[PDB]
Amino acid sequence: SKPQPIAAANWKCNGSQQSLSELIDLFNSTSINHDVQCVVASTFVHLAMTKERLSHPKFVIAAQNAIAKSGAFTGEVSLPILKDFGVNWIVLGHSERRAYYGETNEIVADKVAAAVASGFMVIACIGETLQERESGRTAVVVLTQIAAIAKKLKKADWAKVVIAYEPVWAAGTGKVATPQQAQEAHALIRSWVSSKIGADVAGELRILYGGSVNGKNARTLYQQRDVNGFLVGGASLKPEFVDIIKATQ
Amino acid sequence: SKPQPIAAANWKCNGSQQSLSELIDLFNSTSINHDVQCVVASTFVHLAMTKERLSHPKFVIAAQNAIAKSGAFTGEVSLPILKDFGVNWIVLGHSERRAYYGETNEIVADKVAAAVASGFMVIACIGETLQERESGRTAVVVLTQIAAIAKKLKKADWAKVVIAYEPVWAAGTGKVATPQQAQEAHALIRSWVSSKIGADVAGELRILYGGSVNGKNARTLYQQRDVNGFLVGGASLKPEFVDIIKATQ
Protein backbone atom coordinates (compact mmCIF):
# COMPACT_ATOMS: atom_id res chain seq x y z
CA SER A 1 0.00 0.00 0.00
CA LYS A 2 0.92 3.69 0.17
CA PRO A 3 3.81 4.81 2.39
CA GLN A 4 3.39 7.59 4.98
CA PRO A 5 1.85 10.63 3.23
CA ILE A 6 3.54 14.05 3.36
CA ALA A 7 1.85 17.45 3.63
CA ALA A 8 4.62 19.94 2.86
CA ALA A 9 4.13 23.71 3.05
CA ASN A 10 6.21 25.82 0.67
CA TRP A 11 5.76 29.38 1.93
CA LYS A 12 8.33 30.44 -0.68
CA CYS A 13 9.37 34.07 -0.28
CA ASN A 14 6.47 35.25 1.89
CA GLY A 15 5.28 36.04 5.40
CA SER A 16 5.66 38.48 8.27
CA GLN A 17 6.44 37.67 11.90
CA GLN A 18 2.79 38.33 12.77
CA SER A 19 1.17 36.57 9.81
CA LEU A 20 3.31 33.45 10.15
CA SER A 21 2.71 33.40 13.91
CA GLU A 22 -1.03 33.10 13.33
CA LEU A 23 -0.53 30.25 10.86
CA ILE A 24 1.73 28.41 13.30
CA ASP A 25 -0.74 28.87 16.16
CA LEU A 26 -3.41 27.43 13.89
CA PHE A 27 -1.18 24.51 12.92
CA ASN A 28 -0.55 23.90 16.62
CA SER A 29 -4.29 23.86 17.35
CA THR A 30 -5.05 21.39 14.55
CA SER A 31 -5.97 17.82 15.49
CA ILE A 32 -4.45 15.42 12.96
CA ASN A 33 -5.64 11.85 13.53
CA HIS A 34 -3.74 9.95 10.82
CA ASP A 35 -0.09 9.17 10.12
CA VAL A 36 1.16 12.05 7.97
CA GLN A 37 4.41 14.02 8.03
CA CYS A 38 3.60 17.73 7.94
CA VAL A 39 6.40 19.99 6.73
CA VAL A 40 6.80 23.76 7.01
CA ALA A 41 9.37 25.25 4.65
CA SER A 42 9.86 28.91 5.55
CA THR A 43 12.50 31.43 4.50
CA PHE A 44 15.87 31.23 6.28
CA VAL A 45 14.92 34.39 8.18
CA HIS A 46 11.78 32.88 9.71
CA LEU A 47 13.45 29.57 10.61
CA ALA A 48 14.19 30.81 14.13
CA MET A 49 10.65 31.90 15.02
CA THR A 50 9.30 28.70 13.45
CA LYS A 51 11.69 26.53 15.47
CA GLU A 52 10.42 28.21 18.63
CA ARG A 53 6.69 28.52 17.97
CA LEU A 54 5.86 25.34 16.03
CA SER A 55 5.08 22.61 18.57
CA HIS A 56 2.82 20.16 16.71
CA PRO A 57 4.48 16.71 16.94
CA LYS A 58 3.55 15.79 13.36
CA PHE A 59 5.23 18.91 11.98
CA VAL A 60 8.86 19.30 10.94
CA ILE A 61 10.74 22.33 9.63
CA ALA A 62 12.45 22.63 6.25
CA ALA A 63 14.62 25.08 4.34
CA GLN A 64 13.73 26.07 0.79
CA ASN A 65 17.29 25.93 -0.56
CA ALA A 66 20.96 25.49 0.31
CA ILE A 67 24.44 24.98 -1.12
CA ALA A 68 26.77 22.05 -0.43
CA LYS A 69 29.52 23.66 1.65
CA SER A 70 30.14 26.75 3.76
CA GLY A 71 32.61 29.37 2.57
CA ALA A 72 32.99 32.45 0.37
CA PHE A 73 29.42 32.52 -0.93
CA THR A 74 27.84 35.85 0.02
CA GLY A 75 24.06 35.69 0.40
CA GLU A 76 23.88 31.90 0.42
CA VAL A 77 23.20 29.34 3.15
CA SER A 78 25.00 25.99 3.41
CA LEU A 79 23.91 22.55 4.61
CA PRO A 80 26.26 22.45 7.64
CA ILE A 81 24.84 25.81 8.76
CA LEU A 82 21.31 24.41 8.47
CA LYS A 83 22.31 21.21 10.27
CA ASP A 84 23.86 23.22 13.11
CA PHE A 85 20.67 25.26 13.30
CA GLY A 86 18.56 22.15 13.84
CA VAL A 87 16.95 21.95 10.41
CA ASN A 88 16.74 18.40 9.06
CA TRP A 89 14.42 18.82 6.08
CA ILE A 90 15.02 20.74 2.85
CA VAL A 91 13.39 21.48 -0.50
CA LEU A 92 15.77 21.32 -3.46
CA GLY A 93 15.59 21.85 -7.21
CA HIS A 94 12.36 23.83 -7.28
CA SER A 95 11.30 25.06 -10.73
CA GLU A 96 11.75 28.68 -9.67
CA ARG A 97 15.42 28.07 -8.88
CA ARG A 98 15.92 26.01 -12.04
CA ALA A 99 14.57 28.92 -14.09
CA TYR A 100 15.68 32.07 -12.27
CA TYR A 101 18.82 31.00 -10.42
CA GLY A 102 20.67 28.72 -12.82
CA GLU A 103 20.16 25.33 -11.18
CA THR A 104 20.72 22.73 -13.90
CA ASN A 105 19.90 19.03 -13.52
CA GLU A 106 23.45 18.36 -12.34
CA ILE A 107 23.60 21.28 -9.90
CA VAL A 108 20.34 20.10 -8.34
CA ALA A 109 21.67 16.54 -8.29
CA ASP A 110 24.81 17.66 -6.46
CA LYS A 111 22.78 19.59 -3.88
CA VAL A 112 20.49 16.62 -3.22
CA ALA A 113 23.40 14.18 -2.94
CA ALA A 114 25.27 16.53 -0.60
CA ALA A 115 22.18 16.95 1.58
CA VAL A 116 21.59 13.20 1.81
CA ALA A 117 25.20 12.69 2.89
CA SER A 118 24.67 15.35 5.56
CA GLY A 119 21.62 13.47 6.84
CA PHE A 120 18.87 15.66 5.39
CA MET A 121 15.41 14.50 4.41
CA VAL A 122 15.22 15.86 0.87
CA ILE A 123 12.18 16.95 -1.13
CA ALA A 124 13.61 16.93 -4.66
CA CYS A 125 11.53 18.78 -7.25
CA ILE A 126 11.08 17.77 -10.89
CA GLY A 127 8.62 18.87 -13.58
CA GLU A 128 8.08 20.06 -17.15
CA THR A 129 7.04 23.46 -18.47
CA LEU A 130 3.97 24.24 -20.57
CA GLN A 131 6.36 24.62 -23.50
CA GLU A 132 7.89 21.18 -22.95
CA ARG A 133 4.54 19.44 -22.44
CA GLU A 134 2.93 20.81 -25.61
CA SER A 135 6.00 19.72 -27.59
CA GLY A 136 5.53 16.16 -26.35
CA ARG A 137 8.63 16.16 -24.16
CA THR A 138 7.09 15.70 -20.70
CA ALA A 139 8.50 12.20 -20.24
CA VAL A 140 11.99 12.93 -21.58
CA VAL A 141 12.27 16.07 -19.44
CA VAL A 142 11.01 14.63 -16.15
CA LEU A 143 12.90 11.33 -16.43
CA THR A 144 16.14 13.12 -17.33
CA GLN A 145 15.78 15.30 -14.24
CA ILE A 146 15.37 12.39 -11.82
CA ALA A 147 18.02 10.35 -13.65
CA ALA A 148 20.60 13.07 -12.99
CA ILE A 149 19.64 13.01 -9.31
CA ALA A 150 19.71 9.21 -9.23
CA LYS A 151 23.18 9.18 -10.79
CA LYS A 152 24.68 10.81 -7.68
CA LEU A 153 22.80 8.57 -5.24
CA LYS A 154 23.25 5.08 -3.83
CA LYS A 155 20.39 2.65 -3.18
CA ALA A 156 20.43 3.41 0.55
CA ASP A 157 20.13 7.15 -0.10
CA TRP A 158 16.57 6.94 -1.43
CA ALA A 159 15.20 6.31 2.07
CA LYS A 160 15.94 9.98 2.71
CA VAL A 161 14.62 11.12 -0.68
CA VAL A 162 11.19 12.48 -1.59
CA ILE A 163 10.25 13.38 -5.17
CA ALA A 164 7.97 16.37 -5.73
CA TYR A 165 6.54 16.33 -9.24
CA GLU A 166 5.68 19.95 -10.00
CA PRO A 167 4.59 20.82 -13.55
CA VAL A 168 5.70 24.43 -14.05
CA TRP A 169 2.43 25.32 -15.80
CA ALA A 170 0.59 24.49 -12.56
CA ALA A 171 2.89 26.51 -10.29
CA GLY A 172 0.68 29.22 -8.79
CA THR A 173 -1.21 29.63 -12.06
CA GLY A 174 -4.47 28.12 -10.86
CA LYS A 175 -4.22 25.45 -13.54
CA VAL A 176 -4.12 22.44 -11.23
CA ALA A 177 -3.20 19.15 -12.89
CA THR A 178 -6.06 16.75 -13.59
CA PRO A 179 -6.13 13.79 -11.13
CA GLN A 180 -5.36 11.58 -14.14
CA GLN A 181 -2.62 13.96 -15.30
CA ALA A 182 -1.04 13.79 -11.85
CA GLN A 183 -1.53 10.02 -11.64
CA GLU A 184 -0.12 9.36 -15.11
CA ALA A 185 3.05 11.32 -14.37
CA HIS A 186 3.55 9.84 -10.89
CA ALA A 187 3.08 6.37 -12.36
CA LEU A 188 5.78 7.11 -14.93
CA ILE A 189 8.22 8.35 -12.29
CA ARG A 190 7.53 5.40 -9.99
CA SER A 191 7.90 3.06 -12.97
CA TRP A 192 11.32 4.53 -13.74
CA VAL A 193 12.53 4.20 -10.15
CA SER A 194 11.36 0.58 -10.04
CA SER A 195 13.30 -0.31 -13.19
CA LYS A 196 16.53 1.59 -12.57
CA ILE A 197 16.94 1.54 -8.78
CA GLY A 198 14.63 -1.20 -7.52
CA ALA A 199 11.03 -2.25 -6.97
CA ASP A 200 11.53 -2.05 -3.20
CA VAL A 201 12.70 1.57 -3.37
CA ALA A 202 9.84 2.50 -5.71
CA GLY A 203 7.42 0.96 -3.22
CA GLU A 204 8.89 3.01 -0.39
CA LEU A 205 9.48 6.17 -2.43
CA ARG A 206 7.01 8.99 -1.89
CA ILE A 207 5.98 11.02 -4.93
CA LEU A 208 4.24 14.28 -4.05
CA TYR A 209 2.28 16.52 -6.40
CA GLY A 210 2.82 20.27 -6.47
CA GLY A 211 0.84 22.78 -8.50
CA SER A 212 -2.08 24.90 -7.30
CA VAL A 213 -3.12 22.35 -4.67
CA ASN A 214 -5.94 23.63 -2.46
CA GLY A 215 -8.58 22.45 0.00
CA LYS A 216 -11.05 21.82 -2.81
CA ASN A 217 -8.97 19.63 -5.14
CA ALA A 218 -6.59 17.95 -2.68
CA ARG A 219 -8.79 15.04 -1.57
CA THR A 220 -9.55 13.74 -5.07
CA LEU A 221 -5.89 14.16 -6.05
CA TYR A 222 -4.62 12.06 -3.14
CA GLN A 223 -7.25 9.44 -3.97
CA GLN A 224 -5.02 8.54 -6.92
CA ARG A 225 -2.71 5.55 -6.53
CA ASP A 226 0.74 7.09 -6.95
CA VAL A 227 0.08 10.37 -5.14
CA ASN A 228 1.77 10.28 -1.73
CA GLY A 229 1.09 13.85 -0.61
CA PHE A 230 1.48 17.46 -1.68
CA LEU A 231 3.94 20.33 -1.89
CA VAL A 232 1.65 23.32 -1.37
CA GLY A 233 2.51 26.89 -2.31
CA GLY A 234 -0.23 29.50 -2.12
CA ALA A 235 -2.74 27.56 -0.04
CA SER A 236 -0.10 26.84 2.61
CA LEU A 237 -0.22 30.50 3.64
CA LYS A 238 -3.89 30.07 4.52
CA PRO A 239 -6.04 28.17 7.05
CA GLU A 240 -6.96 26.11 3.98
CA PHE A 241 -3.72 24.15 4.38
CA VAL A 242 -5.35 22.19 7.21
CA ASP A 243 -7.89 20.76 4.76
CA ILE A 244 -5.04 19.61 2.52
CA ILE A 245 -3.49 17.81 5.49
CA LYS A 246 -6.85 16.17 6.19
CA ALA A 247 -7.09 15.34 2.48
CA THR A 248 -4.26 12.84 2.95
CA GLN A 249 -6.94 10.43 4.22
CA SER B 1 37.57 65.84 6.52
CA LYS B 2 36.41 62.30 5.74
CA PRO B 3 32.77 61.29 6.23
CA GLN B 4 31.83 58.86 9.03
CA PRO B 5 33.93 55.71 8.46
CA ILE B 6 32.35 52.25 8.22
CA ALA B 7 33.69 48.92 9.48
CA ALA B 8 31.54 46.23 7.86
CA ALA B 9 31.78 42.51 8.62
CA ASN B 10 30.88 40.13 5.80
CA TRP B 11 30.65 36.71 7.44
CA LYS B 12 29.60 35.29 4.06
CA CYS B 13 28.38 31.69 4.14
CA ASN B 14 30.02 30.83 7.46
CA GLY B 15 29.43 30.43 11.18
CA SER B 16 27.70 28.24 13.74
CA GLN B 17 25.40 29.38 16.55
CA GLN B 18 28.28 28.71 18.95
CA SER B 19 31.15 30.31 17.02
CA LEU B 20 29.12 33.39 16.08
CA SER B 21 27.84 33.83 19.65
CA GLU B 22 31.38 34.02 21.02
CA LEU B 23 32.30 36.42 18.22
CA ILE B 24 29.39 38.73 19.02
CA ASP B 25 30.20 38.72 22.75
CA LEU B 26 33.64 39.99 21.78
CA PHE B 27 32.16 42.67 19.53
CA ASN B 28 29.95 43.62 22.47
CA SER B 29 32.99 43.92 24.75
CA THR B 30 34.93 46.03 22.24
CA SER B 31 35.71 49.61 23.27
CA ILE B 32 35.06 52.03 20.40
CA ASN B 33 35.49 55.73 21.13
CA HIS B 34 35.35 57.36 17.69
CA ASP B 35 32.47 57.98 15.28
CA VAL B 36 32.27 54.87 13.10
CA GLN B 37 29.40 52.72 11.83
CA CYS B 38 30.12 49.05 12.51
CA VAL B 39 28.10 46.54 10.48
CA VAL B 40 27.51 42.81 10.93
CA ALA B 41 26.30 40.98 7.83
CA SER B 42 25.32 37.43 8.80
CA THR B 43 23.54 34.69 6.87
CA PHE B 44 19.74 34.95 6.80
CA VAL B 45 19.64 32.06 9.27
CA HIS B 46 21.75 33.85 11.88
CA LEU B 47 19.92 37.19 11.66
CA ALA B 48 17.64 36.37 14.59
CA MET B 49 20.39 35.29 16.98
CA THR B 50 22.49 38.27 15.92
CA LYS B 51 19.51 40.57 16.50
CA GLU B 52 19.03 39.26 20.04
CA ARG B 53 22.65 39.23 21.20
CA LEU B 54 24.46 42.03 19.33
CA SER B 55 24.27 44.96 21.73
CA HIS B 56 27.07 47.45 21.01
CA PRO B 57 25.49 50.88 20.23
CA LYS B 58 27.87 51.44 17.30
CA PHE B 59 26.83 48.19 15.62
CA VAL B 60 24.06 47.57 13.10
CA ILE B 61 22.99 44.33 11.43
CA ALA B 62 22.91 43.74 7.68
CA ALA B 63 21.83 41.09 5.21
CA GLN B 64 24.17 39.73 2.55
CA ASN B 65 21.56 39.72 -0.23
CA ALA B 66 17.86 40.11 -1.07
CA ILE B 67 15.35 40.20 -3.90
CA ALA B 68 13.10 43.23 -4.41
CA LYS B 69 9.63 41.74 -3.92
CA SER B 70 8.04 38.93 -1.94
CA GLY B 71 6.37 36.15 -3.93
CA ALA B 72 6.96 32.91 -5.80
CA PHE B 73 10.75 32.84 -5.41
CA THR B 74 11.61 29.65 -3.51
CA GLY B 75 14.77 29.88 -1.42
CA GLU B 76 15.07 33.66 -1.62
CA VAL B 77 14.55 36.41 0.96
CA SER B 78 12.86 39.69 0.02
CA LEU B 79 13.32 43.28 1.20
CA PRO B 80 9.90 43.58 2.89
CA ILE B 81 10.66 40.40 4.85
CA LEU B 82 13.98 41.86 6.00
CA LYS B 83 12.41 45.21 6.90
CA ASP B 84 9.72 43.40 8.89
CA PHE B 85 12.55 41.56 10.63
CA GLY B 86 14.07 44.86 11.75
CA VAL B 87 17.06 44.64 9.41
CA ASN B 88 17.74 47.99 7.73
CA TRP B 89 21.24 47.46 6.33
CA ILE B 90 22.16 45.27 3.37
CA VAL B 91 25.07 44.23 1.15
CA LEU B 92 24.26 44.09 -2.56
CA GLY B 93 26.09 43.20 -5.76
CA HIS B 94 28.93 41.26 -4.17
CA SER B 95 31.37 39.80 -6.71
CA GLU B 96 30.48 36.27 -5.62
CA ARG B 97 26.84 36.89 -6.53
CA ARG B 98 27.80 38.62 -9.78
CA ALA B 99 29.78 35.56 -10.84
CA TYR B 100 27.90 32.60 -9.36
CA TYR B 101 24.28 33.71 -9.31
CA GLY B 102 23.63 35.71 -12.48
CA GLU B 103 23.69 39.16 -10.90
CA THR B 104 24.39 41.52 -13.80
CA ASN B 105 25.01 45.27 -13.53
CA GLU B 106 21.29 45.89 -14.04
CA ILE B 107 20.18 43.20 -11.59
CA VAL B 108 22.41 44.77 -8.94
CA ALA B 109 21.15 48.24 -9.84
CA ASP B 110 17.49 47.25 -9.55
CA LYS B 111 18.16 45.63 -6.17
CA VAL B 112 19.91 48.74 -4.84
CA ALA B 113 17.10 51.01 -6.03
CA ALA B 114 14.40 48.84 -4.45
CA ALA B 115 16.41 48.69 -1.23
CA VAL B 116 16.88 52.47 -1.07
CA ALA B 117 13.18 52.92 -1.82
CA SER B 118 12.45 50.54 1.05
CA GLY B 119 14.48 52.65 3.48
CA PHE B 120 17.56 50.43 3.54
CA MET B 121 21.14 51.56 3.98
CA VAL B 122 22.97 49.86 1.12
CA ILE B 123 26.55 48.69 0.74
CA ALA B 124 26.85 48.36 -3.04
CA CYS B 125 29.82 46.30 -4.23
CA ILE B 126 31.82 46.94 -7.39
CA GLY B 127 35.16 45.65 -8.64
CA GLU B 128 37.13 44.31 -11.59
CA THR B 129 38.64 40.86 -12.11
CA LEU B 130 42.38 40.25 -12.39
CA GLN B 131 42.27 39.71 -16.15
CA GLU B 132 40.33 42.97 -16.48
CA ARG B 133 42.98 44.84 -14.49
CA GLU B 134 45.86 43.39 -16.52
CA SER B 135 44.17 44.48 -19.74
CA GLY B 136 43.70 48.00 -18.38
CA ARG B 137 39.93 47.56 -18.25
CA THR B 138 39.58 48.46 -14.56
CA ALA B 139 38.21 51.96 -15.20
CA VAL B 140 35.63 51.01 -17.82
CA VAL B 141 34.50 47.98 -15.81
CA VAL B 142 34.01 49.51 -12.36
CA LEU B 143 32.62 52.84 -13.58
CA THR B 144 30.07 51.04 -15.74
CA GLN B 145 29.03 49.05 -12.67
CA ILE B 146 28.43 52.20 -10.63
CA ALA B 147 26.82 53.92 -13.63
CA ALA B 148 24.22 51.16 -13.89
CA ILE B 149 23.40 51.70 -10.22
CA ALA B 150 23.32 55.49 -10.58
CA LYS B 151 20.84 55.04 -13.44
CA LYS B 152 18.06 53.99 -11.06
CA LEU B 153 18.88 56.50 -8.32
CA LYS B 154 17.87 60.07 -7.52
CA LYS B 155 20.23 62.58 -5.89
CA ALA B 156 18.65 62.21 -2.44
CA ASP B 157 18.96 58.41 -2.63
CA TRP B 158 22.74 58.57 -2.29
CA ALA B 159 22.39 59.38 1.41
CA LYS B 160 21.33 55.76 1.86
CA VAL B 161 24.07 54.44 -0.42
CA VAL B 162 27.55 53.13 0.39
CA ILE B 163 30.03 51.97 -2.25
CA ALA B 164 32.37 49.06 -1.54
CA TYR B 165 35.21 48.78 -4.04
CA GLU B 166 36.22 45.12 -4.05
CA PRO B 167 38.69 43.94 -6.71
CA VAL B 168 37.92 40.28 -7.45
CA TRP B 169 41.62 39.36 -7.44
CA ALA B 170 41.75 40.50 -3.80
CA ALA B 171 38.59 38.74 -2.62
CA GLY B 172 39.68 36.14 -0.08
CA THR B 173 42.96 35.54 -1.90
CA GLY B 174 45.42 37.21 0.47
CA LYS B 175 46.52 39.43 -2.40
CA VAL B 176 45.49 42.74 -0.83
CA ALA B 177 45.61 45.92 -2.91
CA THR B 178 48.49 48.26 -2.09
CA PRO B 179 47.65 51.57 -0.35
CA GLN B 180 48.19 53.45 -3.63
CA GLN B 181 46.18 50.85 -5.55
CA ALA B 182 43.16 51.40 -3.31
CA GLN B 183 43.58 55.18 -3.34
CA GLU B 184 43.75 55.32 -7.15
CA ALA B 185 40.58 53.26 -7.56
CA HIS B 186 38.73 55.20 -4.85
CA ALA B 187 39.83 58.53 -6.33
CA LEU B 188 38.57 57.32 -9.71
CA ILE B 189 35.22 56.22 -8.29
CA ARG B 190 34.72 59.45 -6.33
CA SER B 191 35.72 61.61 -9.30
CA TRP B 192 33.08 59.89 -11.41
CA VAL B 193 30.39 60.45 -8.78
CA SER B 194 31.38 64.12 -8.55
CA SER B 195 31.08 64.73 -12.29
CA LYS B 196 28.01 62.63 -13.07
CA ILE B 197 25.97 63.00 -9.87
CA GLY B 198 27.41 65.97 -7.97
CA ALA B 199 30.37 67.20 -5.93
CA ASP B 200 28.26 67.43 -2.77
CA VAL B 201 27.22 63.78 -3.03
CA ALA B 202 30.80 62.79 -3.81
CA GLY B 203 32.04 64.58 -0.70
CA GLU B 204 29.56 62.83 1.58
CA LEU B 205 29.83 59.51 -0.26
CA ARG B 206 31.67 56.77 1.60
CA ILE B 207 33.82 54.36 -0.41
CA LEU B 208 34.91 51.21 1.41
CA TYR B 209 37.69 48.87 0.35
CA GLY B 210 37.19 45.11 0.47
CA GLY B 211 39.61 42.32 -0.35
CA SER B 212 42.02 40.60 2.03
CA VAL B 213 41.65 43.33 4.65
CA ASN B 214 43.11 42.26 7.99
CA GLY B 215 44.21 43.81 11.28
CA LYS B 216 47.76 44.32 10.01
CA ASN B 217 47.11 46.10 6.70
CA ALA B 218 43.97 48.04 7.64
CA ARG B 219 45.89 50.87 9.33
CA THR B 220 47.93 52.07 6.35
CA LEU B 221 44.97 51.46 4.03
CA TYR B 222 42.67 53.86 5.89
CA GLN B 223 45.37 56.54 5.80
CA GLN B 224 44.56 57.11 2.12
CA ARG B 225 42.39 60.17 1.50
CA ASP B 226 39.57 58.39 -0.33
CA VAL B 227 39.27 55.29 1.86
CA ASN B 228 36.25 55.56 4.16
CA GLY B 229 36.35 52.11 5.74
CA PHE B 230 36.36 48.40 4.96
CA LEU B 231 34.23 45.43 3.97
CA VAL B 232 35.88 42.46 5.66
CA GLY B 233 35.38 38.76 4.95
CA GLY B 234 37.77 36.20 6.41
CA ALA B 235 39.17 38.46 9.12
CA SER B 236 35.64 39.42 10.20
CA LEU B 237 35.17 35.86 11.47
CA LYS B 238 38.15 36.47 13.74
CA PRO B 239 38.94 38.63 16.80
CA GLU B 240 41.19 40.46 14.33
CA PHE B 241 38.15 42.41 13.09
CA VAL B 242 38.35 44.33 16.36
CA ASP B 243 41.64 45.92 15.27
CA ILE B 244 40.23 46.80 11.83
CA ILE B 245 37.57 48.86 13.60
CA LYS B 246 40.24 50.91 15.39
CA ALA B 247 42.18 51.22 12.14
CA THR B 248 39.65 53.85 11.07
CA GLN B 249 41.53 56.27 13.34
Short mmCIF file of N, CA and C in Angstrom, two decimals, chain B residues 32 40 66 218 228:
data_model
loop_
_atom_site.label_atom_id
_atom_site.label_comp_id
_atom_site.label_asym_id
_atom_site.label_seq_id
_atom_site.Cartn_x
_atom_site.Cartn_y
_atom_site.Cartn_z
N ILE B 32 34.95 51.17 21.57
CA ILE B 32 35.06 52.03 20.40
C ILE B 32 34.71 53.46 20.77
N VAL B 40 27.40 44.27 10.94
CA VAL B 40 27.51 42.81 10.93
C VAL B 40 26.55 42.21 9.91
N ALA B 66 19.32 40.16 -1.07
CA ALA B 66 17.86 40.11 -1.07
C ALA B 66 17.31 40.32 -2.47
N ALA B 218 45.09 47.11 7.61
CA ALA B 218 43.97 48.04 7.64
C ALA B 218 44.40 49.46 8.01
N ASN B 228 37.16 55.22 3.07
CA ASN B 228 36.25 55.56 4.16
C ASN B 228 35.85 54.36 5.01
#
